[PDB]
Amino acid sequence: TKQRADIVMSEAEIADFVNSSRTGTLATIGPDGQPHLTAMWYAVIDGEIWLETKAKSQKAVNLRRDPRVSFLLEDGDTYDTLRGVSFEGVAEIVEEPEALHRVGVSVWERYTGPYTDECKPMVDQMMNKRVGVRIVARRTRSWDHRKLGLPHMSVGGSTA
Numbered sequence: 001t002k003q004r005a006d007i008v009m010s011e012a013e014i015a016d017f018v019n020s021s022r023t024g025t026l027a028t029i030g031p032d033g034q035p036h037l038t039a040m041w042y043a044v045i046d047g048e049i050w051l052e053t054k055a056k057s058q059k060a061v062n063l064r065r066d067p068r069v070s071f072l073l074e075d076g077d078t079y080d081t082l083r084g085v086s087f088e089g090v091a092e093i094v095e096e097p098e099a100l101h102r103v104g105v106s107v108w109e110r111y112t113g114p115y116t117d118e119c120k121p122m123v124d125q126m127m128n129k130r131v132g133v134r135i136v137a138r139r140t141r142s143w144d145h146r147k148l149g150l151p152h153m154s155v156g157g158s159t160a
Helices: 013-019 058-065 097-111 115-128
Strands: 024-029 034-038 043-045 048-056 070-076 083-094 132-142
Touching: 013 083, 013 132, 024 058, 034 058, 043 097, 048 058, 048 083, 048 097, 058 132, 097 115, 097 132
Parallel strands: none
Antiparallel strands: 024 034, 024 070, 043 048, 048 132, 070 083, 083 132
16 A cells, blocks of 8 residues: 655665664464564575564464564664664464575574674574574565765754
């Protein structure tokens, strides 16, 4: 239901934003239909967002029952700098060991430092009894309020 042409990000800008961000919000569907929200760090592999979770975590249980997911990334502190991307789609649960190791390595590189073979036991342990969750988007909406050319605002109010 939309997508403003003025503030939409390009395919390439979204890619940069997904690689640059640290935290998004995942929604899965609870057993009574209630949206279940968690703030997630993530992996990025061949352009796609992947998550790691315990095989028996609530999110993995929601997802086997109903694969539908939403995932939201956002930043910016002023109206003129708000930017983000919102994905709706389906998740696949993957326990294939090569795939898990790629998830573990991407998370390691994204949030820890460069990966070397001597980090393997530690990545093995992070990913032990975990599954990969590949996010496949079918609907994407994005925004970058910098494309309005508004005057720059500094952050204000009581929450500054």
